[PDB]
């Protein structure tokens, strides 16, 4: 197990070329948390309760924008030169209709 831990740490680390990212800035997942704590042999009752509370708190409630605009797009003619509403278009401002 000690030799395996050495090998895994060596494959993990690249300190000569760059520093390791800070854990306090990263965020991880409860699935990995649960499997690691289970490997350590702790009881996951409290952590599972916290995760259940978080999952119940993060609810998805739809709104009118979700009903109306959810599968639609556009609602404005796409310009030929990627221009804003009041941006001049030197090339096309003299030709009003799209056929011409």
């Amino acid at each position: 197990r000690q030799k395996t831990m050495i090998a895994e740490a060596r494959n993990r680390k690249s300190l000569k070329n760059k520093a390791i990212m800070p854990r306090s800035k990263l965020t991880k997942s409860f699935g990995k948390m649960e499997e690691h704590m289970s490997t350590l042999g702790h009881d996951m009752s409290a952590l599972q309760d916290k995760q259940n509370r978080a999952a119940r708190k993060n609810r998805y409630v739809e709104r009118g924008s979700d009903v109306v605009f959810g599968d639609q797009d556009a609602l404005t003619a796409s310009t030929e030169n990627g221009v804003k509403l009041r941006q001049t278009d030197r090339l096309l401002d003299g030709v009003a209709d799209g056929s011409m």
Partner: protein, 62 residues
């Protein structure tokens, strides 16, 4: 997607080199929306963009 502008703006906003800025590869659409330094600052605050630590040059042997 092309995030070159966001990478440059993140380096300028955080105050480090472009070599020291981490853009979350999972949040590509959110990062691609951010066209201003204000939106870049918001991404830095919530952690989509991270400042990397310096590469170590130890002096223990010296």
């Amino acid at each position: 997607a092309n995030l070159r502008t966001q990478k440059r703006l993140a380096a300028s906003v955080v105050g480090v080199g472009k070599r020291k800025v981490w853009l979350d590869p999972n949040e590509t659409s959110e990062i691609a929306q951010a066209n201003s330094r204000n939106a870049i600052r918001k991404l830095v605050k919530n952690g989509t963009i991270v400042k990397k630590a310096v590469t170590v040059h130890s002096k223990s042997r010296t």
